[PDB]
Amino acid sequence: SALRVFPVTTELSPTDKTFEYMTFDKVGTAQIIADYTDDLPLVDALGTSEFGK
Amino acid sequence: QINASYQRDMAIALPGMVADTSKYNIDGACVVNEGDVLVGAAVQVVQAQAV
């Protein structure tokens, strides 16, 4: 029943050997400030990937 | 009668005022803890939060 328990997709060509998928993320923060402030915190983003055969 | 003309000069500075606009730096993410702080007086840092 392994073909009915889990989904079966169709995305790879008959000549493929490897597939990849990506992921993204972000970081950052915030603070309480005053009238004159020059120290605002910053933010950034990320990324990563995986492989299959 | 002889007329008169009077002239007075402004003061130069106030306590805690920035003197020259030459490459300063201001920290505004501080908080006063357990006391009062006068303008134009030095301060000290008791504890800086980690996160």
| Contact: A32, B31; criterion CB under 8 Å | yes
Resolution in A: 3.5
CA distances from A22 to A10, A11, A43, A44, B31 (A): 19, 16, 21, 17, 42
Q: Tell me the chain A residues in contact with residue B32 when contact means C-beta distances shorter than 8 Å.
A: none
Residues 6+ apart with CB under 8 A from A41: A28, A29, A30, A31
Discontinuities in chain B with C to N beyond 2.5 Å fall right after none
For residue B17, the surrounding DSSP H or E stretch is: none
Quote the longest CA-to-CA distance of chain B: 76
B14: helix, strand or coil: coil
Beta partners for A46? A25
DSSP one-letter string for B31-47: ---SS---TTS------
Method used experimentally: cryo-EM
Query: Whole-angstrom Cα distance, residue A35 to residue A15?
Result: 63
Residues 6+ apart with CB under 8 A from B15: B38, B39, B40
A38 touches chain B (CB under 8 A): yes
